[PDB]
């Protein structure tokens, strides 16, 4: 046979590249799956990840306790962090020892799969009671903030999409819906009456991962790398694995 | 310049009245919320709220165990009143250390926005194991009931819809879900194939919030009036901020 | 009047048939429910039951931590299993006491009413961080299933459908999602635009109930056989009740 590397006959070299990228482009199929994650960054160090993983759409609803730092297994002050809550919901509104609640959310980053359509991205950042701007009557159920998705870029290959906004301030103090679309370059409506039904069951299909990890050494070690998840950490540096048209 | 409240050129009360018309209108709009709020009245005085707030539709769906009163961080007696599941799920199926559980709600009130139609409530009061009428094989899954709603007004407006129903007696354990479609009179269907993924993306971006306070005043103090939205308290008082061409 | 059981004017027996009949081919109508059970079984007998009650289509989505067993009100060493969820969604990812958390379910029995068409059921059976198959690159979200359901006859109804599989391996570390949907039989689509709106607010009406039984007997006694639901047991013996043309 050809020796390895040197003639167009290293038929493992093109399986090997043919791998990676049906990996990618099947992903960015109708077939394939549109990925969001949702992560929590407490002042602990530690970082609690929503994830959910569905086909066509995919979305996370939050309010502002659940978003709240919760240590498995140990001391939470449950009853002091309830307190929290009533004076969050409304000043002055509870009896909790503390002017700060540390379970308190310090930063949000949204993330996406490169399968999603950044013009499909929608938020709902609202308020500690769940209204997206102060009061119903004026709210828009959310913002297209897609232009703000930065692209997770490794080795030239985008691998994912980030928004990151900090919440350094006492007054950040939120409920986070996010909702992305899955590509379709096509104009096949996915939920037309062809496929609809198909939509409707991928709601009860869309699986759905949560943890708090101790700290975002660990995510990237035992989540993010682990499963070839795209990740952006706290110094700029992107995390992913490129596979279109790659070995 | 023309002295205030005497000429047509009070620009500043125009723009006033022009506000609270716009939110009023806006959220009829097919951009706007549609909200719904589920109150579970407990016999100590206290109310747990579950509110959702969500575009085109919204809904709430409730089991037997998840109705129950919970007091965050106090004692809840867990394994006695998992036993009272067991008693309720089939008679005689538990060992509870008491007849009538004091968790269990006594009353229901469902308020919906403004922005709701009535025709298209629909609600599924269940028995204890979630079975809408007894049976599955003679189970309609909803119930029409917009025609028992009142109409929450204040200063001649309408500021929401209200269903209330108690729950005295022994054989009420209930499952509960409710839901109701935000109003449409164009006749521009919002799920059909122009913006049909949009309405799934209002499945992912709904807010949903739930607390129980302590009891009804502070729930009309620090919810209810301090985020505009209607009630009915036990006393058949409205509360509501009219806005449809008001200053 | 006639004497009964002798003539065809024994109205009391044709209405006795008539009552089944309906009520078996209401289920099987676009306005019945449709209903999935997802049982997941323990080592020490117990048995959690997972139920969802909705029109059109019916689901319900776990993953690995919400299938593990909890017994309220018990101990459960939260901390230990949380570090068993570590140590079970990266190898040697935690610390727990214990190579085999026994919280973990040694099998999963899937059950449809008999309204479901097979041909639509979906399921995801995922890994231990809700990926479908290992890595979302390549990862088709779901699996279409229903050539492996087998009939529960009773009487020669068929009164459901059942998956099973065992569990009973290390490395039988799953997430799962099902989907299924309500027999069609006619071409008038349910969720084409005349009835979209419907199939969304089934999404909200859906009715969910869990609970964990101690034992298979007391899930069929108090649960099973109390609410008219099909089941197959361990030793292969079937329950429901077969209603059409039936007294
Ligand atoms: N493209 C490129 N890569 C370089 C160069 N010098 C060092 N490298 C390293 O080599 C890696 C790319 O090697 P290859 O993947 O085999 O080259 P390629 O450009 O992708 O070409 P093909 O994969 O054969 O189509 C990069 O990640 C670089 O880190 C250079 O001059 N050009
Ligand atoms: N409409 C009305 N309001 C009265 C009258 N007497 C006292 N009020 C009080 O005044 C309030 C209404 O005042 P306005 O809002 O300025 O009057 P309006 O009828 O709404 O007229 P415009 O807002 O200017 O269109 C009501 O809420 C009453 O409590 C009365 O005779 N007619
Ligand atoms: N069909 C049938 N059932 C029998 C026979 N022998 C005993 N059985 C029992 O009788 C039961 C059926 O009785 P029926 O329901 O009154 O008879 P059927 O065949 O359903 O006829 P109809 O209901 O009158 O239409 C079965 O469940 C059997 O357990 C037999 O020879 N034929
Ligand atoms: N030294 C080099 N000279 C020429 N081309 C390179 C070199 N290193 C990488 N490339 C090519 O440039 C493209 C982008 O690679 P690059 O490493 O710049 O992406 P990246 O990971 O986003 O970089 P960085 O994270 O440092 O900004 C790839 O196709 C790669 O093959
Ligand atoms: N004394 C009054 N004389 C004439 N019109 C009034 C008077 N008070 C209020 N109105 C007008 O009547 C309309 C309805 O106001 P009203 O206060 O009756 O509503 P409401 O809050 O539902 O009353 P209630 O709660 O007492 O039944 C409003 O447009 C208001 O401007
Ligand atoms: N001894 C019998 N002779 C003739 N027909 C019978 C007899 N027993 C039952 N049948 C009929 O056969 C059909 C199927 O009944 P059968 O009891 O076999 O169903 P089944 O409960 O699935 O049986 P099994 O669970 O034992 O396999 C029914 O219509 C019933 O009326
Ligand atoms: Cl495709
Ligand atoms: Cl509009
Ligand atoms: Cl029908
Ligand atoms: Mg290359
Ligand atoms: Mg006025
Ligand atoms: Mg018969």
Same mark, same amino acid.
């Not at 994650?37 to 502002?64: H, M, P, T």
């Not at 809550?85 to 490169?114: L, M």
């Not at 990151?164 to 096949?188: A, D, R, T, W």
């Given at each position: 046979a050809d020796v390895a590397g040197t003639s167009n006959r290293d038929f493992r070299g093109r399986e090997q590249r043919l791998y990676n990228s049906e990996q990618y482009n099947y992903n960015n199929s109708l077939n394939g799956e549109v990925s969001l994650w949702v992560y929590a960054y407490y002042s602990d160090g530690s970082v609690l990840v929503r994830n959910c993983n569905s086909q066509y759409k995919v979305g996370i609803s939050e309010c502002f306790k659940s978003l709240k730092e919760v240590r498995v297994?140990?001391?939470?002050?449950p009853y002091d962090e309830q307190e929290v809550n009533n004076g969050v919901y409304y000043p002055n509104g509870g009896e909790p020892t503390?002017?700060?609640?540390? @379970?308190? &959310?310090?930063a949000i980053q949204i993330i996406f799969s490169p399968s999603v359509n950044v013009h499909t991205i929608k938020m709902a950042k609202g308020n500690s009671v769940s209204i997206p701007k102060d009061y119903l009557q004026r709210?828009?159920?959310?913002?297209?903030?897609?232009?703000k998705y930065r692209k997770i870029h490794v080795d030239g290959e985008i691998v994912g999409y980030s928004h990151y906004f900090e919440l350094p301030h006492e007054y950040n103090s939120i409920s986070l819906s996010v909702s992305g679309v899955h590509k379709n370059?096509?104009?096949?409506?996915? @939920?037309? &009456?062809?496929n609809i039904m198909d939509v409707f069951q991928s709601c009860d299909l869309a699986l759905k991962f949560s943890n708090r990890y101790w700290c975002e050494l660990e995510l990237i070690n035992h989540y993010i790398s682990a499963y070839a998840y795209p990740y952006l950490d706290i110094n700029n540096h992107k995390y992913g694995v490129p596979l279109n048209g790659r070995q």
């Amino acid at each position: 046979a050809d020796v390895a590397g040197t003639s167009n006959r290293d038929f493992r070299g093109r399986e090997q590249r043919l791998y990676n990228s049906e990996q990618y482009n099947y992903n960015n199929s109708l077939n394939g799956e549109v990925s969001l994650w949702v992560y929590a960054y407490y002042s602990d160090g530690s970082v609690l990840v929503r994830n959910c993983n569905s086909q066509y759409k995919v979305g996370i609803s939050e309010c502002f306790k659940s978003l709240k730092e919760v240590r498995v297994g140990q001391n939470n002050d449950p009853y002091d962090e309830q307190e929290v809550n009533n004076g969050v919901y409304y000043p002055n509104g509870g009896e909790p020892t503390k002017f700060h609640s540390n @379970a308190k &959310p310090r930063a949000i980053q949204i993330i996406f799969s490169p399968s999603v359509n950044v013009h499909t991205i929608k938020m709902a950042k609202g308020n500690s009671v769940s209204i997206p701007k102060d009061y119903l009557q004026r709210s828009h159920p959310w913002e297209a903030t897609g232009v703000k998705y930065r692209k997770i870029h490794v080795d030239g290959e985008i691998v994912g999409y980030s928004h990151y906004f900090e919440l350094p301030h006492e007054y950040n103090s939120i409920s986070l819906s996010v909702s992305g679309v899955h590509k379709n370059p096509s104009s096949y409506n996915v @939920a037309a &009456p062809h496929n609809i039904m198909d939509v409707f069951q991928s709601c009860d299909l869309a699986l759905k991962f949560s943890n708090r990890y101790w700290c975002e050494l660990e995510l990237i070690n035992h989540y993010i790398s682990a499963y070839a998840y795209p990740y952006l950490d706290i110094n700029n540096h992107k995390y992913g694995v490129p596979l279109n048209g790659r070995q």
